[PDB]
Design a protein around this ligand. Structure first.
Ligand code: AMP
Ligand code: CL
Ligand code: MG
Ligand code: MG
Ligand code: MG
Length: 145
């Protein structure tokens, strides 16, 4: 009965003059499982969470950080792994305006879509990640709009 810890980024960008209608986020499809979400991964030894999140984003999508926003999001879920071990997993997401063209690492990302938070919600089935996007949509509205 293991505990797993992961760190990721919700990557956002404005396709035009910044506003509610022009914010999009980089939704990705996970090669291992084909569920949708955001880039994330494990911290290397002694790495801080934000450092691990930045490195995992660059490794998986080639995107670079413009600015972090002063906000994090946390989810907790449980599953059984390939070898049938019960896992309790905690994922911490940072939120960042990003730059670059996406170049997915196909070993981890098998599809990419830039969508509004509400559009991307349609791709999400697990309740915990739906809560994440609901909170993130609530945040960008109060913080920016
Ligand atoms: N919210 C969730 N609830 C239950 N299982 C999940 C959830 N998210 C991902 N999984 C599963 O956990 C495994 C690892 O997914 P991930 O942590 O997203 O790499 C895969 O088998 C996923 O289908
Ligand atoms: Cl992970
Ligand atoms: Mg990953
Ligand atoms: Mg990774
Ligand atoms: Mg990794």
């Amino acid at each position: 009965t293991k505990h797993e810890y992961s760190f990721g980024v919700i990557p956002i960008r404005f396709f035009g003059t910044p506003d509610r209608s022009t914010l999009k986020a980089c939704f990705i499809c996970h090669t291992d499982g084909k569920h949708w979400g955001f880039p994330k991964g494990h911290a290397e030894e002694k790495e801080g969470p934000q450092e691990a999140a930045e490195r995992e984003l660059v490794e998986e999508t080639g995107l670079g950080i413009v600015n972090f926003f002063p906000k994090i999001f946390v989810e907790n879920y449980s599953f059984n792994d390939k070898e049938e071990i019960f896992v309790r997993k905690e994922v911490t997401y940072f939120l960042a305006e990003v730059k670059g063209e996406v170049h997915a690492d196909p070993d981890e990302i098998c599809d990419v879509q830039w969508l509004s938070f509400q559009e991307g919600l349609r791709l999400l089935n697990f309740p915990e990640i739906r809560n994440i996007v609901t909170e993130a949509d609530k945040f960008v509205q109060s913080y920016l709009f």
